[PDB]
A paper describes a structure:
AJLec was purified from A. japonica and identified as a Ca2+-dependent and galactose-specific lectin (18.5 kDa) forming a disulfide-bonded dimer. Hemagglutination inhibition assay, ITC analysis, and glycoconjugate microarray revealed its strict specificity for β-linked terminal galactose, but not for GalNAc. Accordingly, AJLec was assumed to be a novel type of lectin with a unique structure and specificity.
Therefore, the dimer structure, formed due to the formation of the disulfide bonds, was supposed to be a functional dimer in solution. The dimer structure forms a helical-bar like shape, where lactose binding sites are located on both of its termini. The protomer structure of AJLec was composed of a core structure with seven β-sheets and three surrounding helices and loops. A lactose molecule in the site was bound to a Ca2+ ion, where its glucose residue was quite solvent exposed whilst its galactose residue was mainly buried in the binding site groove. β-galactose residue in lactose is held by two coordinate bonds with Ca2+ ion and two hydrogen bonds with side chain nitrogen atoms of Arg64; hydroxyl groups at positions 2, 3, and 4, and oxygen at position 5 in the β-galactose residue form hydrogen and coordinating bonds in the site. In addition, the Ca2+ ion coordinately bound sidechain oxygen atoms of Glu141, Asp150, and Asn151, and main chain oxygen atoms of Met147 and Cys48, present in these sites.
Author numbering:
A (entry chain A), B (entry chain B): 1 to 164
Write the structure that this text describes.
Amino acid sequence: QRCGGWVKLNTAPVCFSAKGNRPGSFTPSHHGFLKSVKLRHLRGLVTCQSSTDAHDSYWGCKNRNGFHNYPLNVFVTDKHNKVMFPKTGATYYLDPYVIKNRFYGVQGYNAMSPELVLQHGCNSPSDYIGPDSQLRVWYGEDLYNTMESDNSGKVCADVFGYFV
Amino acid sequence: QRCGGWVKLNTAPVCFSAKGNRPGSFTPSHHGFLKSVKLRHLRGLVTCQSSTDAHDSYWGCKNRNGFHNYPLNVFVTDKHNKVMFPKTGATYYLDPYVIKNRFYGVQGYNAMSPELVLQHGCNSPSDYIGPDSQLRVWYGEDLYNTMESDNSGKVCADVFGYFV
Ligand SMILES: OC[C@H]1O[C@@H](O[C@H]2[C@H](O)[C@@H](O)[C@H](O)O[C@@H]2CO)[C@H](O)[C@@H](O)[C@H]1O
Ligand SMILES: OC[C@H]1O[C@@H](O[C@H]2[C@H](O)[C@@H](O)[C@H](O)O[C@@H]2CO)[C@H](O)[C@@H](O)[C@H]1O
Ligand SMILES: [Ca+2]
Ligand SMILES: [Ca+2]
Ligand SMILES: [Ca+2]
Ligand SMILES: [Ca+2]
């Protein structure tokens, strides 16, 4: 029902944990093709290493190890856990120890950004958001089952979209 | 860029006449969903009343009768002659004598604009431009079979798209 945006897609807060296959899953209120989403932090912190508070963040694992420049670790998928955001604008940390974990950065944002904008890139037919779609906000280490056991926290957010 | 810049959709110039069911037809070189197209005049002129060269234009019928301010009459359709551009941003001339002819204006452009940008509005599934698609650049009086017999000319253009 909406062209452009931002338009709020969620009803209730969308809340994700950092382990245990616990994404924040919801049925979007509006249909169409999305250019991007904007995640607006409401409450909570997650971390990829619970032995310290140093990495606690909205969207990832801040100031961690050797990759302070790849602090993000949130992915918005469809109901099949296929990533829809980000698909552009993100650079990934590629060291083999944690390549599969998919830590990333987006220039202009960090893991403490009050609002995080993630780009879809251009659309293909199967990217349509319809009545049957579900979006899932995942922590990457949870999604990929990489080193999740030492994670903790829970973040709640609103999710806005921009339709094209 | 392929996703984000003007992308040339045609190869050879796209040439349309103003009568005789003679749109300029082509299969786009790139697939996906468009926000807009840009038509770039290359050569030729068309008119909606051939008794003089007064109205000869790139995109319509310039300085004609009652509708100097609605001089445009080009439409980009799919292979079933369904209009895809413009679908927003166009103001139609509604005088009963020529309402069906679908003369229109777009702010900041006229029928001699070297380039004309036409907006699609937001996309639905059936707006996909794929390998089976054919885009057609029509003269409106020819598309709608309204007062076409006194038309003449042929315009050739390049056609660019903005993918989303
Ligand atoms: O290197 C970044 C990586 O650290 C993981 O934690 C390691 C921890 O540092 C190490 O002492 C322990 O032996 O193994 C842990 C992994 O099982 C974090 O879990 C991971 O999220 C990354 O941040
Ligand atoms: O009124 C705009 C309309 O004019 C049509 O031409 C008229 C013409 O002016 C009239 O003298 C003739 O006898 O009837 C024509 C229509 O069949 C143009 O063809 C049309 O394109 C409009 O520009
Ligand atoms: Ca971890
Ligand atoms: Ca998991
Ligand atoms: Ca005519
Ligand atoms: Ca015709």
